[PDB]
């Protein structure tokens with residue numbers, strides 16, 4: 001329904017991540033925590049680091065419990081010490097839970113200078129928790145210990161322009177609704193895709209279009225080796241072969257302007273005179289997802305206002321191409337999530353999408369969530385082995 005206490009509780013941006021305020025320990029220690037649907041550990045800075053202005057001080061918490069076990073995570077990388085403590089979300093459900101916490105003591109290229117977050121809240125399933133699936137993730141603890149419904153929803157709000165150091169701290173970056181769906185955060189209908197398996201938030205893509213033109217690849221290629229929804233990734237990441245076909249089609253649709261190789265590789269910015277970004281030359285991208293009804297799919301459509309990420313250069317409007325290659329499957333990252341209100345319905349093993357009330361668009365085109373479409377043999381789109 002309406003969850004006013006949680007609306008507008010996020011800050012950040014697609015390139016540095018979106019974070020929520022949390023408290024750990026007794027008395028409570030306030031920390032900003034990155035919302036990550038791509039991992040399943042709650043891990044916080046617990047020792048001085050040049051990029052941290054605060055960290056979890058276990059010796060100052062009367063409710064700290066030492067699990068006497070280390071955790072080593074090479075992905076960047078971080079190392080820590082496992083323990084439990086009382087955790088709350090001030091702009092969240094009015095509950096306090098006893099949760100696992102990985103106290104980060106050593107790290108390399110993990111913390112981002114100026115991101116304003118000091119830890120990560122892994123919201124995915126126990127299967128991918130470190131060191132193993134016996135370390136209960138935060139959300140599992142929250143549901144087990146309280147009457148909070150087994151569901152959360154995310155509205156990540158891209159500003160559509162660069163935010164400087166002060167503006168990003170003062171700006172609302174979106175909402176994380178814990179235990180519900182807030183109807184003010186979306187327009188139109190919510191469409192649901194099944195969660196294929198509970199590890200990452202794995203989904204099945206059944207068709208891809210660029211300006212309505214079918215990419216026409218065997219649908220197994222779109223999900224090779226998996227397709228996931230990940231708020232902790234900036235870009236829309238596509239499998240190598242899919243990325244090559246998609247970039248060729250996006251280049252062909254936008255061919256009235258020639259961009260350098262570095263732009264298409266997501267490395268180099270492109271700039272236009274203030275207000276003149278030629279949105280209309282870039283195509284919309286539609287991803288069709290498996291529906292909840294047999295032989296039915298629906299589509300989510302994004303604009304270049306989602307896949308062109310605003311960056312500072314001057315008075316020019318500058319962007320980086322936020323679609324990149326992957327060797328680990330499709331990743332529907334923040335730049336795709338910015339177009340939609342996304343419902344992680346764990347209780348019903350499904351993910352919902354609706355057009356976000358905060359998506360960036362122009363007067364001629366909008367993001368969309370539409371259906372149904374008749375789609376056959378959708379289970380064949382899923383990859384095995």
Ligand SMILES: COc1nc(N2C[C@H]3C(=O)N(C)C(=N)N[C@@]3(c3ccc(F)cc3F)C2)nc(C)c1F
Nearest residue numbers: 017036038039041043073075120122130230232233
């Ligand atoms: C919290 O614990 C664990 N965390 C991770 N992560 C893997 C990282 C990554 O590559 N992506 C795409 C991701 N989505 N998240 C991460 C992440 C996100 C934003 C960021 F600025 C830094 C990050 F490191 C964090 N992986 C395991 C197994 C963890 F146990």
